[PDB]
Every structure is written in structure tokens, then in C-alpha cells.
Amino acid sequence: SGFRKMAFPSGKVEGCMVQVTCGTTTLNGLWLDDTVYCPRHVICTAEDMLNPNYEDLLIRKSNHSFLVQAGNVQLRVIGHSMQNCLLRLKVDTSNPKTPKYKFVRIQPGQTFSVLACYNGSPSGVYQCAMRPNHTIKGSFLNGSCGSVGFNIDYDCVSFCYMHHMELPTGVHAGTDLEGKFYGPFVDRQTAQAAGTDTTITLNVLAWLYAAVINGDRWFLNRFTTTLNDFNLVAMKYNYEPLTQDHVDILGPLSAQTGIAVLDMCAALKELLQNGMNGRTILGAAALEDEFTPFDVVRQC
Amino acid sequence: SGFRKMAFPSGKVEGCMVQVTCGTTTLNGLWLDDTVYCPRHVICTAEDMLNPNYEDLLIRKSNHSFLVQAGNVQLRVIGHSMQNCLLRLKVDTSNPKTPKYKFVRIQPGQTFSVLACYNGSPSGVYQCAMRPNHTIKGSFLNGSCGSVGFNIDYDCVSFCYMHHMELPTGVHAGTDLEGKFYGPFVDRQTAQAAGTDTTITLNVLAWLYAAVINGDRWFLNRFTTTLNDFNLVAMKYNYEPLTQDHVDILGPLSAQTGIAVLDMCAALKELLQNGMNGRTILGAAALEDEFTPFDVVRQCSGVTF
């Protein structure tokens, strides 16, 4: 009955991780059935990343150029095709561990589990949220490229992210499982930057509801607010504006705590204005926003 | 790379999770080769939790009393025996997913990952620490009893925790995989409470070396301290006394940054006396105490399994 940053169990994804090498470059690939997805920049080398032409680089590559490996075993790549920023290699072996899966594109503010990898082997798993500026603040040392974010519903894995690169600020950028980047980024060593990021207002409130559900109700107050006035304040603090939609989503949690949503806004409003009094919420000494209402409901 | 709180990949432990039932009581079990480990209070029903005689209740228990399930399939239990607060069920089938493994008892301040399960099916994995008062600030709903905690080494899974129960505090308590409780707790619905917690000073130091490694180093200074002086401060802020033995466990991290342990203590000392000044460390508004010296080497030196 506590509150941990939880990830989905990583098992189904672990049995999908492989290693993909081209010359001196190695990163991670996701092996599903007879297909291996990985970031297309596994083909660039040195003075390529300096704006390269992937069509041009790919056409010059042969199926034997790709050294794919599941543990000891190489897998024979018997075909390929680019799809936006991914490579979709074909192989002569099917992965018997392939779980029920689908590809989904995820909205900013949502969360997922990341199984970080290096040379095809799992290092660790962790939960995070897609920032509103489309970056993710993960733990990603060079070589982790091709790690995947995923969600798990019952038996079925929804892949939503593959890591590609780190930005200057030190945050990370990637694509869905169809090669589409998240955010206005390109896989080239051109100097790009993160859009400004806001705090995920919807998540903070869910987190605050999770505090209450756990016997922590010190931040609560008696006043209320309109949606209008809460936004006027929250946006001053670089919080994302709040929509009636966001309010409804908080419906079940309010029902469960008895605390009205705008009242909880009134609480957050006060927390934003008046520091935090050195007090802690769920052990945190700042406000958390990498928890969705779904998550809170799930864990609590 | 940022710096997150990572759990170990849970696949190998997922492969050993099962469902154990005695009448109405359904919890989780750990299936290794032909043994299933679960908390012995699975035998209890209702007010048996109120100080029960496990020795006598079990004497009346018969093998087929136990309903053990992996996925849809039933695992025939063909024998049982108690080991402190655990049941050891014998089954007719060796677990084909049994990983290389061992049991170890963990010490206060050490960390590990928990795979929280329900009806023998995993729901989530997270990273927590064994508190100084011998509790764990976990996340458990009812049904999670039998959920296990582990660390992985190369290929070898080290099981160190099996969840039994929650305290009035909202914290959690359970055993090593030999049935031995952590701290002074017994598996009975009686009146037990956790002692006051302290901040795991060793870990906070590790967390600070971590920051430095990531180039987050605004908090260092050109000064040092003694154990005694650092301890006279720490203890005012409810930090655990740092021992010479602790100092040695930081050796790898102090060598990799070339910053002496006592030199970092002096910086910690000043963080305590002067707060953080609105600034952050690894983006955190506060000091982290649940990353071990080991966790850091691991996560900052891309170690896989």
C-alpha cells in the first residue's frame, strides 16, 4: 500500500532483444516473428552521421553486411527495407518467444516501461513519461540505442518507443515502432535542441490523489477554484494548461477520495504558490508528474 | 544519460511465479526446480492470522489441500514441509524455467528489485531498499503476499526477499528465502510496529558520487572532515552513523572519481547544514538514499545480464 515508480515486468520484451552490428557499430534490435527492427543509423559510420543519405547508404549494403545475434547464435538476415527511421530486417528464423504485441503511437504526458540494453543484453528496466516537449529523461549511455519503451495490457505488449539518440541537454529522442520520430527531431548529428518542457499537470494531480489514498492529506485545503483561475496560476509556474477533458479523466479518483477535482486544484494551486514547507508528499520533496491517473488507479 | 532508479530485468523471476491456494487463501509462490516456496500463512483462514499454531495447523494439512497453478495448468503437490515462516511444497514437475540462482540474506541499506504479483501473475517491478529499521517502503495490495525480491549477478538470480505482510505504518515486512524474518517481526496478526527510520548515509554518499560522475559537481569543496565531525552533524539530521567499513565500500567510487570519501563527507556536511539553495542534484530537489555504491557502478558502467 505504498507508492513506487513501477514498470511492467520486462520478460516478454527480453525474449525479443537482439544485437545488430554493421562494421564497427553495434546497437539493439527488436526481433518479432521473422523481423528485426532497429534504428536505421546502424548503417552510418563516422562522417555519415554528419547529414547522411539513408536511401543512398542502404542501397549499397548487402544482407551479409548485417551481423545479427541472439546470444551466441547469429541470425541470417535474408532481406531488408527501410521504414522512416527504422530498418526492418528479415531473417530465416522465427522468434518462438514473440509475445502478443502491437505497435502504438503514444501521446506526450503518457508513461511507459523502458528495457535498457547494450549489445542485445538487458541491463535494467524503468518507468518514465514522454515529456510534453517529446523528449524522455532516461538513463541512456551510448550503445543503448534500440532499447524499447512498452506498455502491457493483460497478455499483450504495446511497443511505443525505440531510442535513437541523446540531445545536448542530455535528454533522449526516439520514434514509434514505425520510424516516426517523437518531436521535431532527425537522426543526424546536426545541432538540434529540446522544445521547452512543461510539467504534466494531469499527472501531478493524480499523484496528489495517490498521496491521499495513502493517508497523506496535509496539502489539502478548504478553498476551491475555477478551471480558469487554476490555469492562470499554474501556467505562471510552467505547468501545462488544464482542460475539462483532463478533469473528467480524474473523475474516478475524485469519486474514490471524495475530494473534488477543482478542490484538488485548489490544493495544487496553494502548493505552487507557497513552497512546500520542507514537508514531503509520498516521501517526495518536490512534485511528481510521471504518474498518470491510469497508473495511480492501477497501483492503488 | 539521465539517472533513473532502475530495477533488474524481471524475466527470469517471472518464469518462476505461481499461484498457491489453501481454501480461500490465495497467494503467490516461488517455483524453483521441484520446490514451490510460499509464505506459511497460506494455510491460515481469517482469525488464524490472529496468533496461530502453524505447527498444529500444518499437521492437519494434506498435500492435495494445496492448489498450485502455473498459467492454466495444475502442479501436483506431492509433499510439504515448513521452514521457519515458509512452506516448501514438493511438486511432480521441475520448473523448466528455473534460472541459476541462490538465496542470500540481505543487510540494512542494501537494495533489490521487487516483482509484485497477484494470482501468480506479475503486475509490476520496482526498485526499493531494506530500511535501517528493517522494513521496506514497498507497494503492496492484498494478494501480493509471496511476492519476491532479488538482485541479478551475471546470469545468477539472488533471491533475498519474500513478502509476508504490511505494518500499521504502511511499510512492509517479510523473510529471506530460508524463512527468517527481517528485523524483529513475526508472522502473526499481533501488535508490532516499526522503529524510527534513518537516512542511509552510505547510499546518499554513493548518490553524490553518481552526480559527480554525471558531471553534476557544483556541491564539492576544497575541504575535508573526520568521521567523528561528520557523524556529529549527520546524526543531527537523522542520518545513519558512517563507519570505517562504509568508507571502504565507497572505495571503487572514490577511486573512479579520485575524490576521497571523507572529502565527500565534508560536502555532504555542508549540504545538510545549508540546504540545497533551490538548486538540484541529478535534477533532484532532495538527496537520494536508496541507491547503493554497487547500483551506481552498475548503472554508470553499463552492466548487463
Side-chain angles (χ1 to χ4, degrees), chain B residues 141-186:
Chain B
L141 268 24
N142 58 154
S144 73
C145 304
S147 285
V148 305
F150 58 100
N151 293 284
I152 306 178
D153 325 273
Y154 314 80
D155 59 349
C156 187
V157 175
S158 279
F159 294 110
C160 70
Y161 182 84
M162 167 159 270
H163 180 61
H164 279 260
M165 52 165 39
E166 174 173 300
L167 274 47
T169 326
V171 297
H172 306 109
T175 59
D176 61 21
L177 269 283
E178 278 190 336
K180 254 76 159 157
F181 261 89
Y182 279 109
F185 304 101
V186 294

Side-chain angles (χ1 to χ4, degrees), chain A residues 79-138:
Chain A
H80 62 271
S81 67
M82 195 173 49
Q83 170 182 40
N84 302 312
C85 306
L86 299 184
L87 288 195
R88 304 181 24 242
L89 309 179
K90 311 292 318 187
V91 287
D92 63 311
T93 326
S94 151
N95 175 11
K97 294 178 170 178
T98 298
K100 273 198 189 89
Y101 69 95
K102 71 199 173 182
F103 295 170
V104 307
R105 201 177 161 82
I106 233 189
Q107 297 295 136
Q110 309 197 232
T111 47
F112 57 89
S113 294
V114 171
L115 172 60
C117 292
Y118 295 103
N119 285 40
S121 32
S123 177
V125 54
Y126 70 81
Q127 184 76 351
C128 70
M130 160 96 65
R131 297 316 305 169
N133 70 0
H134 300 276
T135 65
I136 96 172
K137 305 184 179 210

